[PDB]
Structures are given as C-alpha cells and as structure tokens.
Amino acid sequence: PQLHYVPYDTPVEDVMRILKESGTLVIRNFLDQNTVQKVQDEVDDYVRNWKTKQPSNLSLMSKTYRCEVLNHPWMHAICERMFGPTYGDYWFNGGSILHLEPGENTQPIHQDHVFYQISKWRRPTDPDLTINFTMALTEFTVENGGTRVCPGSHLWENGHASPAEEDMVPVLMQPGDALILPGSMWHSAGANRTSEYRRGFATSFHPCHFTPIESHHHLPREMVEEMTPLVQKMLGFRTLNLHNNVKVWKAGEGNLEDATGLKSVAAKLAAAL
Amino acid sequence: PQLHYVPYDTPVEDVMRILKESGTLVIRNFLDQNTVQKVQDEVDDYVRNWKTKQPSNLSLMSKTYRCEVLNHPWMHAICERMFGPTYGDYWFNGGSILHLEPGENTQPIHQDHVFYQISKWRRPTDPDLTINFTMALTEFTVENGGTRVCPGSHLWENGHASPAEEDMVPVLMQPGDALILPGSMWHSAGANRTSEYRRGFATSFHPCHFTPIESHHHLPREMVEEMTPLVQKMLGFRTLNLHNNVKVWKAGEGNLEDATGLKSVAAKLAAAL
Numbered sequence: 001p002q003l004h005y006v007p008y009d010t011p012v013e014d015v016m017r018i019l020k021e022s023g024t025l026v027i028r029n030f031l032d033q034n035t036v037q038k039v040q041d042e043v044d045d046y047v048r049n050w051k052t053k054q055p056s057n058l059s060l061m062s063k064t065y066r067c068e069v070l071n072h073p074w075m076h077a078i079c080e081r082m083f084g085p086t087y088g089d090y091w092f093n094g095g096s097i098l099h100l101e102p103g104e105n106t107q108p109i110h111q112d113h114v115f116y117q118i119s120k121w122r123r124p125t126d127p128d129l130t131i132n133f134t135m136a137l138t139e140f141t142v143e144n145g146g147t148r149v150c151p152g153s154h155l156w157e158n159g160h161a162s163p164a165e166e167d168m169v170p171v172l173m174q175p176g177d178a179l180i181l182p183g184s185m186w187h188s189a190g191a192n193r194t195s196e197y198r199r200g201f202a203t204s205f206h207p208c209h210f211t212p213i214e215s216h217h218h219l220p221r222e223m224v225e226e227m228t229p230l231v232q233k234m235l236g237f238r239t240l241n242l243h244n245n246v247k248v249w250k251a252g253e254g255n256l257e258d259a260t261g262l263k264s265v266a267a268k269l270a271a272a273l
Numbered sequence: 274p275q276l277h278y279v280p281y282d283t284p285v286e287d288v289m290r291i292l293k294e295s296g297t298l299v300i301r302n303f304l305d306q307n308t309v310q311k312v313q314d315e316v317d318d319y320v321r322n323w324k325t326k327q328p329s330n331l332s333l334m335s336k337t338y339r340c341e342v343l344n345h346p347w348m349h350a351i352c353e354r355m356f357g358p359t360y361g362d363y364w365f366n367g368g369s370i371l372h373l374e375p376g377e378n379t380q381p382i383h384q385d386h387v388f389y390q391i392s393k394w395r396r397p398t399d400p401d402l403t404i405n406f407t408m409a410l411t412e413f414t415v416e417n418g419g420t421r422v423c424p425g426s427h428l429w430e431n432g433h434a435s436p437a438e439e440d441m442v443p444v445l446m447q448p449g450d451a452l453i454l455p456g457s458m459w460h461s462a463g464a465n466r467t468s469e470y471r472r473g474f475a476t477s478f479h480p481c482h483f484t485p486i487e488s489h490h491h492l493p494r495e496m497v498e499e500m501t502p503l504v505q506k507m508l509g510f511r512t513l514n515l516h517n518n519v520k521v522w523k524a525g526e527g528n529l530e531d532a533t534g535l536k537s538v539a540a541k542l543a544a545a546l
C-alpha cells in the first residue's frame with residue numbers, strides 16, 4: 001500500500017480500488033479556489049471567536065457548506081458505492097473546522113470509527129462505518145501539522161496496536177485538495193511547528209441506520225428550504241430508504257418531508273391570483 | 274427455556290435473568306385498565322379509518338402514549354440494563370397498533386432485528402439490537418391470534434431456520450398485560466379465527482447510535498413541550514450520551530435541546546411584571 005495523489009477526473013472505480021487496497025488517498029483540486037475562499041470567508045470570524053480548534057455546526061454557519069459542499073459529486077459517488085449495496089441510503093455524520101494554532105502538538109493516532117461500539121463486531125473486509133473528507137483550506141505541509149496516515153492499516157484486525165509514529169506518512173496538500181479517510185484508517189494531525197495556523201475542514205457520511213454525530217434539527221426552516229433534496233436527506237430532514245421498501249426515519253408510515261410540508265406543493269390558483 | 278408470566282412487582286434482576294435464559298416473558302398488569310381505555314379511546318377512530326392494521330405515529334395521535342406510556346418504569350428499567358453498559362443512552366425505535374381483523378391469517382415467524390444489516394455481525398451473546406413491549410388492549414387468546422413465541426430461540430446462531438409452527442408457544446394475555454420481545458426472539462401474530470378483532474399496541478427502544486424506525490420531527494412544538502425530559506430524549510429531541518463524554522445527535526458541539534430552546538429558561542423579571 002501507498003499514499004496516492006490522484007487528479008479530480010480519476011474514474012470513480014479507480015478511487016474505490018485505491019481505497020480498498022490502501023485505505024486512503026488524496027484527490028487533487030477537490031475544491032476550486034473560489035470554494036476555499038467562500039468557506040474561509042463564511043467561517044473565519046467563527047473560528048477566531050471559538051491550540052486546536054474544531055468548531056462544527058458548519059451547515060448552519062456556512063451557506064457554501066450547505067448549498068454547495070454537501071452536493072459534492074465525489075462525496076456522493078464514493079458514498080453510494082461504499083454504503084449503498086449493504087445499507088441503502090447514507091447521510092451526514094459530522095463535520096468540523098480542523099484548525100491547528102502554531103505550537104500545537106501531534107494529535108494521538110486514531111481510527112475515526114472507534115466511538116461506534118459495533119466497530120468491535122465489524123471485520124476489516126466489511127464496509128466502513130463512516131467516511132471523512134478532509135479538505136485543505138491552507139496548505140498542509142509536514143511542518144505545519146498536515147494530517148498523517150498509515151496506508152494499509154485499514155486492513156488490520158480489531159485490537160491491533162496503533163502505528164508507530166515513524167510509520168506515519170504525512171499528507172502534503174494545496175488549498176482545495178482533499179484527503180479521503182475511511183473510518184478504519186489510522187491517522188492523526190501533526191504538530192504545527194510553524195508560525196502560521198494550518199486549517200482544513202471536513203464532511204463525513206455514514207449509513208442511514210446509524211445516528212449522526214450532529215443533528216440539524218435546530219437549523220431555521222428557511223435554511224432547510226434552500227437545500228437540495230439530496231442535502232435535505234443528508235442533514236436529517238427526509239425519510240431514509242434501506243432495501244426492499246424498508247425505511248427508517250419515517251413520520252408514522254409516511255415520509256418525514258411530506259409530514260413537515262418541506263416538499264414543495266403547488267398553490268391553489270385562487271391564492272396565486 | 275419456558276414462557277414465564279410474572280407479576281408486575283417481580284424484581285428487575287429476575288426479569289433480566291429470564292430474558293437472558295428464555296428470550297421473552299409476560300409481565301402481568303403492565304398497564305392498568307385506565308391506561309388501556311385511554312389509549313383505546315385516543316386511537317380507536319384512527320384505527321378504523323386506517324386483515325392486519327399497523328398504524329404508527331402513536332406519540333402524535335395519543336396523549337396518553339406520549340405523556341404516560343413512554344415514561345413506563347419497566348421499559349426504562351429494562352432498557353437501561355440492556356443497552357446502558359455497552360452503548361450508554363437508548364431511544365425510541367418504533368411503535369404501532371397491532372390489530373388483527375377476524376379472519377386474518379398467521380403472520381410469518383420472524384425476528385424483529387432482521388432489518389438491521391449489523392444483525393449479521395452480531396452474536397447471540399451480544400446485547401440485542403432492539404426491544405419491543407407488546408401490550409394487550411383486547412385479550413390475547415390462541416383463537417384470536419395472540420402472539421406466539423419460541424422460548425430459547427434468541428440464542429440460535431444467525432442463519433438458523435425459523436422455528437416450526439408446531440414449536441410456537443401462544444401468549445395468553447388479559448388487557449394490560451405485556452409481552453417482552455427482544456429483537457432476537459422468533460415470534461409472530463397468529464390467525465384470528467374468531468368474530469372479534471384482536472388488538473394490542475407496542476413501544477420499542479434501541480441504542481442511541483442506531484436510527485429509529487420513526488422520526489418525531491413533525492410533531493408540533495406544543496406536544497414536545499408537554500413531554501418529560503426523558504420522553505423528549507426518547508423521541509429524538511435531545512442530544513444522546515454514549516460513554517466518556519462522547520455524544521451523538523449534537524447541535525454543533527452543544528446540546529440539541531438547548532439550541533432549539535426546548536429547555537425551559539426563566540423569564541426576565543420585567544417581562545414577568
């Protein structure tokens with residue numbers, strides 16, 4: 001296994017194969033510079049007012065996050081293939097700013113899926129329990145604490161010791177590149193030994209039958225109405241389909257998004273006039 | 274293993290032991306006749322307007338369900354012990370009326386947990402994935418299709434064939450008795466060979482890290498404010514605690530019920546005056 005950096009236009013099949021073999025990869029130019037700047041602009045004061053800062057609530061705080069980032073075609077292409085065959089639908093798990101102040105120490109090496117009790121029942125050949133997209137806002141370098149990964153460690157059995165620090169491979173990214181982190185990949189933020197902060201931000205998704213880290217039930221109705229149907233489902237506003245007519249997150253026997261009136265209906269002609 | 278019928282005042286420890294050994298049991302007088310009648314009164318028109326009827330949405334349709342039944346001390350005593358050590362919090366999964374018209378045929382024998390993909394990873398010695406309380410509204414008899422169980426079948430390995438029909442043990446209940454059905458117990462409704470309908474209703478609960486069959490996000494704010502804090506958590510209005518400060522269903526980094534203003538605050542003295 002190896003850390004691969006692939007162009008945006010790499011076929012989805014090839015990315016899935018790299019994930020299976022190596023457990024992680026970087027997609028270059030995952031976001032353009034416009035999206036990097038709009039996200040920075042929308043979150044920068046929230047981060048400063050928040051040596052590690054990880055504020056979440058990103059769909060509430062960032063219109064670009066809820067209207068654009070969560071529709072990202074690479075996220076959905078990967079998630080449909082990782083979760084679809086086994087579970088059906090998937091939805092958003094959590095997502096935060098990943099901000100390292102100058103002087104921050106190395107983060108403990110971990111698997112993101114450790115907080116699922118069912119990770120103890122899972123085998124390394126089973127689908128992952130969650131998947132994270134870690135997108136660079138600043139450059140990620142060795143010296144500023146860019147995330148480090150241990151390619152192949154997603155295949156280790158449960159209870160395997162963490163990789164040694166010397167086994168960790170730093171991920172070198174320009175603003176807008178993204179690191180893909182299945183829940184089984186061992187990884188960690190590095191130490192920021194520079195005088196400038198290192199910042200990225202994440203999305204993550206997991207099967208529809210697992211409860212997200214973050215609810216979005218507190219978001220204003222008006223924000224929910226500006227989301228696409230897909231993002232409404234990602235953020236907990238729609239009923240979820242398993243397989244063969246099995247649904248969870250139902251309003252009684254019907255769909256939540258019908259019961260809440262979230263789905264658009266046509267006005268009566270008289271009301272329009 | 275045997276089907277046991279126990280009095281309401283049976284110690285919780287003894288009920289948990291019976292569940293472990295036999296996989297099911299009946300608690301007599303689980304509800305009093307007042308609660309049976311109030312639930313019937315609140316749902317009867319909804320059932321008739323709905324040879325098997327299983328309408329859900331019970332917290333919306335029944336004040337007694339959301340204000341009284343979901344606070345039932347036996348449900349919480351069992352669920353805390355079944356789910357607490359492994360997962361921390363639990364919450365409501367689904368609950369419907371269980372109505373058999375005269376002439377209905379025997380229901381396929383099943384385990385309730387089959388729709389969880391992770392039931393394939395679980396072992397019979399692991400905690401159940403869900404637990405159901407099936408409460409009699411009418412009497413449950415052999416002839417009217419009272420639920421049947423196969424004591425001990427919760428310990429069978431995954432992929433074991435269903436019990437034979439001749440192995441099924443009918444559950445004979447008076448109005449207000451309750452049958453306890455862990456997700457691993459094989460069971461089914463029987464045929465209603467009488468001229469009168471047979472009706473019960475259910476609650477069910479499962480670990481906080483799994484997505485409920487039913488959302489309650491469509492319920493009016495005013496109904497949510499009349500629930501106890503416990504029932505608010507049961508029905509998806511509160512952040513959920515795993516272990517060692519891990520939470521899911523958070524509003525950002527804080528609690529959902531704070532972000533929505535669901536938790537009562539004291540008015541300003543001037544506003545009160």
Ligand SMILES: O=C(O)CNC(=O)C(=O)O
Pocket residue numbers: 098099112145146147148187188189190
């Ligand atoms: O910030 C980083 O580079 C990596 N962070 C994490 O893996 C995390 O917080 O789970």
Ligand SMILES: O=C(O)CNC(=O)C(=O)O
Pocket residue numbers: 371372385418419420421460461462463
């Ligand atoms: O209605 C009954 O007696 C039993 N019903 C079920 O087990 C069910 O619908 O899952």
Ligand SMILES: [Fe+2]
Pocket residue numbers: 110111112187188
């Ligand atoms: Fe991580």
Ligand SMILES: [Fe+2]
Pocket residue numbers: 383384385460461
């Ligand atoms: Fe059942």
